[PDB]
Amino acid sequence: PEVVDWFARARRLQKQQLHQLAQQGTLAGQISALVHMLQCERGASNIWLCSGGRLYAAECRAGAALVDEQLTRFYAALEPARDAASSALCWRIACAVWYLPQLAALRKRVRDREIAAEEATGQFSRIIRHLLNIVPQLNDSIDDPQIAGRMVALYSFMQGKELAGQERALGALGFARGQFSDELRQQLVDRIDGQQPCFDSFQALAQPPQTALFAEQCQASLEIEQLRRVACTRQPPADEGETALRWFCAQTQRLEQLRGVEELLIVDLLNAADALLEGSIALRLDKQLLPLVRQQAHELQQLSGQLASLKDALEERKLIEKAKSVLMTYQGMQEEQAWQALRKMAMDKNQRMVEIARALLTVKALW
Amino acid sequence: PEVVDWFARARRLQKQQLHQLAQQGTLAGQISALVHMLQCERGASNIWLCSGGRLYAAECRAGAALVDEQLTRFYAALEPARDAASSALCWRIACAVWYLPQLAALRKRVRDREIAAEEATGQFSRIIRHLLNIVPQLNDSIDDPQIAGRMVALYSFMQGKELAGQERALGALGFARGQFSDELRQQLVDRIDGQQPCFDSFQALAQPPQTALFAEQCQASLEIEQLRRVACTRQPPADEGETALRWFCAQTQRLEQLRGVEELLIVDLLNAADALLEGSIALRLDKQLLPLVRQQAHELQQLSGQLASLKDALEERKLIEKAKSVLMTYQGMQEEQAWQALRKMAMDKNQRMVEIARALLTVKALWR
């Protein structure tokens, strides 16, 4: 009866949407490439600055050029959206497009070394962050469940990879100074913690050949694992940039492996979109709308937001200090020992430290 | 340059969306009213069935008439929505409209008493849930930040009120039987804890005059609180329906108070809609997109689905059983004592029992 008409419209709308999957997939792929080159540029700039202008100048120069190439292709890929993007998507594109022109200024300062590594790192990260924020919004305008599923798996991956890039940066800073402040250490830990939800989401949503590829091509790194423990537990070697470089090179190799997988996710998504363009109701509705999947996308985007917010960072640190007190009081731990205990529980349960701390505070009646 | 170009198109699109506000606001109001009448019918049918066809026949008949009256208005409010409906909104609407025609069959069984109170309760609840699921979807085509914020606050409130209604039904069943099984008790507890995030979300998002009205009009009930404690602790009195009625009536007054506030929210939303028709980027962005607000709507829908799913219910019970074992082993608690401890922590911390359970399993290396 009336029901048939609501399905007829839903189906009409979805068939129209079919024709935008190509432009949408291409934009996502183009955002991925730009972000990747920006990640390369951020890395080279970091070493350039931490080395006092001794190293990686060539890489900075090649990086910037490759970024400029991808910028062109990104602006090209935005064209289809000019007369089709929703209000919310337009806002996301606007914020991303707003920061891009700052590259000129930023590069000059990196070149002249009139900026600190943490600052330049922060500015590259912000540009990247707003570019990535386009993706989930892109997904809100995609009705096909298979493709929306692939978009969220891809975004999850891209977001984990970005947090891996921030791990590289923060760790390089610490090893270059020869010390990790408690602040820097916490940020490093937060960048490592944060990857977990991202790649977990990716594994839950990806296709079997994709996760197979991930497990094979992106194996855990012993050296990175050891270096993480060093940064979190003791003074690094005073080898004047040598350990920083070992860290940087190992992380760079990991990031290149991740990129190899990411490129395949984008190929698979484009091919899948091509295929589609070749033509109980409640149970069916969840499979069609994928509400929990799209929520996951929003949660990762939100997690990203919080890591870039000082308000949020200090809020979470408040909880962690509280949880440390509980361990200090009821368990006779020392401050550093309390922090390490929470950190260890976070690793073992695959949760962030603030999640462990909140958990401890909710059941504190038992202490 | 290009920047202003994107902002210009956004503003322009938003301006155009102002024209859908009246029908979106109206549809939300008609959904609210239909859900309310269905809640009245659910409760009447429940007393009719639990009293073995002795009480509430008049209320059932009247309630059904009111529902039919609102269905007409609901179906009318759908006509304008058609022209602006996204694919996902179409699906939500189709789902809700798919179950509506089943009311006739359900009522006949209710009259003939050829259905159990829990079964009749569940079928009303299912129609209600799909109607409610339309509301958050309404936001996928609402660009205005203030309105979208109002829609989520309303949905949060509507959802808390629905769960309060399920609390009434579950408690009445238990008191009518003279016993709460461990099962019925968990479902009751779950309906009560579920209300917390709904009304917390409403309070965070509503306007000060709206939270004010709520704080004054919908104050906690000592009688309901005492009866909750009875249902969760000891055996209820075998007074052949007397306590059940006491429960039902207290809860029904509570729901009418909530309804008063809900009607205000709708009036306010409509006024705001009319007044709109007649009118540091990370900062501007958040204010405009309201990611936290969309997150809240997500979570409440998630909670809603979980309470409706046996898979989800049993997944969560597994966690609660594990947490109980932890208390039984490392703290020497009896099983019932263990369960009571978890429920207690959940009230005190304003979290669901499964969240308390998860918290304890997360840190149990500390007890080890």
DSSP assignment of A259-308:
HHHHHHHHHHHHHHHHHHT---HHHHHHHHH-HHHHHHHHHHHHHHHHHT
Cβ distance of A143 and B88 shorter than 8 Å: yes
Rounded Cα–Cα distance for residues A38 and A83 (Å): 28
Which burial class, exposed, middle or buried, applies to B128 when counting CB atoms under 10 A from its CB (0-12, 13-18, 19+)?
buried
Instruction: Give which of B12, B91, B292, B310 to mutate to test A binding, by max A Cβ within 10 Å.
Output: B91
Chain B contact for A215, CB < 8 A? no
Which residues, 6 or more positions from B212, have their beta carbon under 8 angstroms from its beta carbon? Answer: none
How many angstroms separate the most distant Cα atoms in chain B?
A: 77
Instruction: Give which of A87, A193, A312 to mutate to test B binding, by max B Cβ within 10 Å.
Output: A87
Amino acid at B80: P
Q: How many helices (H) does chain B have, and how many strands (E)? A: 17, 0
- Report A:65-104 residues touching B (Cβ under 8 A): 82, 85-88, 90-95, 97-98
Amino acid at B94: A
Residues in chain B: 368
Place of tokens 């009120």: B161
Rounded Cα–Cα distance for residues B327 and B343 (Å): 13
Would you give the DSSP letter of residue A67? H
Amino acid at B60: C
Which residues, 6 or more positions from A279, have their beta carbon under 8 angstroms from its beta carbon? Answer: none
Would you give the DSSP letter of residue A1? -
Q: How far is A246 from chain B (nearest CA, A)?
A: 35
Chain B contact for A7, CB < 8 A? yes
Query: Which residues in chain A have their C atom more than 2.5 Å from the N of the next written residue, marking a break after them?
Result: 279
Rounded Cα–Cα distance for residues B307 and B27 (Å): 25
DSSP assignment string, B142-180 = ---HHHHHHHHHHHHHHHHHHHHHHHHHHHHHHHHHT--
Which burial class, exposed, middle or buried, applies to A54 when counting CB atoms under 10 A from its CB (0-12, 13-18, 19+)?
exposed
DSSP-based three-state secondary structure for B269? helix
Tokens for B313, please give them: 């219910």
Q: Which of A28, A39, A15, A106 is nearest to A259 (CA)?
A: A39
Report how far apart the first and last C-alpha atoms of chain B are (Å, whole number): 62
Tokens for A239, please give them: 């080898």
Tokens for A330, please give them: 């009821």
Please count the other Cβ atoms lying within 10 Å of the Cβ belonging to residue A311.
8
Cβ distance of B9 and A85 shorter than 8 Å: yes
Rounded Cα–Cα distance for residues B296 and B285 (Å): 18
Give me the helix-helix angle, B222-232 and B242-277, nearest 10°: 120
Rounded Cα–Cα distance for residues B26 and B59 (Å): 27
DSSP-based three-state secondary structure for B309? coil
Minimal Cα distance from B145: which residue of A? A88
Which burial class, exposed, middle or buried, applies to B295 when counting CB atoms under 10 A from its CB (0-12, 13-18, 19+)?
middle
Q: Which of B352, B361, B356, B343 is nearest to B302 (CA)?
A: B352
- Report B:218-277 residues touching A (Cβ under 8 A): none
Q: Are B123 and B166 in contact (CB under 8 A)?
A: no
Cβ distance of A295 and B302 shorter than 8 Å: yes
Rounded Cα–Cα distance for residues A183 and A337 (Å): 16
Cα dihedral A332→A323→B348→B177 (10° resolution): -90
Amino acid at A187: Q
Rounded Cα–Cα distance for residues B348 and B196 (Å): 12
Chain B contact for A330, CB < 8 A? no
Which residues, 6 or more positions from A9, have their beta carbon under 8 angstroms from its beta carbon? Answer: B82, B85, B87, B90
Place of tokens 């190799």: A253
Please count the other Cβ atoms lying within 10 Å of the Cβ belonging to residue B258.
22
Q: Which of A319, A327, A326, A324 is nearest to A354 (CA)?
A: A319
Minimal Cα distance from B296: which residue of A? A295
Cβ distance of B295 and A302 shorter than 8 Å: yes
Which whole-number Å values give the CA distances from A113 to A60, A109, A298, B80, in the listed order? 12, 6, 37, 61
Please count the other Cβ atoms lying within 10 Å of the Cβ belonging to residue B325.
15
Place of tokens 């050829």: B114
| Main-chain dihedrals φ then ψ at residue B300, nearest 5 degrees | -75, -40
Place of tokens 């709507």: B297
Q: What angle do CA A307, A312, A314 make, to 5 degrees?
A: 105
Rounded Cα–Cα distance for residues A268 and A146 (Å): 11
Place of tokens 């490129």: A263
| Main-chain dihedrals φ then ψ at residue A113, nearest 5 degrees | 60, 40
Query: Which residues in chain B have their C atom more than 2.5 Å from the N of the next written residue, marking a break after them?
Result: 279
Q: Are B36 and B259 in contact (CB under 8 A)?
A: yes
Q: Are A308 and A190 in contact (CB under 8 A)?
A: no
Minimal Cα distance from A293: which residue of B? B298
- Report B:13-72 residues touching A (Cβ under 8 A): 13-14, 17
Q: How many helices (H) does chain A have, and how many strands (E)? A: 17, 0
Task: Please give the distance of CA A309 from its chain centroid, rounded to a whole number.
Answer: 15
Q: Which of B156, B165, B67 is nearest to B110 (CA)?
A: B67
Give me the helix-helix angle, B57-82 and B21-50, nearest 10°: 160
Q: Are B363 and A356 in contact (CB under 8 A)?
A: yes
Which whole-number Å values give the CA distances from A238 to A54, A157, A223, in the listed order? 18, 35, 18
Rounded Cα–Cα distance for residues B305 and B300 (Å): 9
Cβ distance of A281 and B95 shorter than 8 Å: yes
- Resolution, in Å, please? 2.1
Rounded Cα–Cα distance for residues A291 and A277 (Å): 24
Residues in chain A: 367
Q: Are B350 and B200 in contact (CB under 8 A)?
A: yes
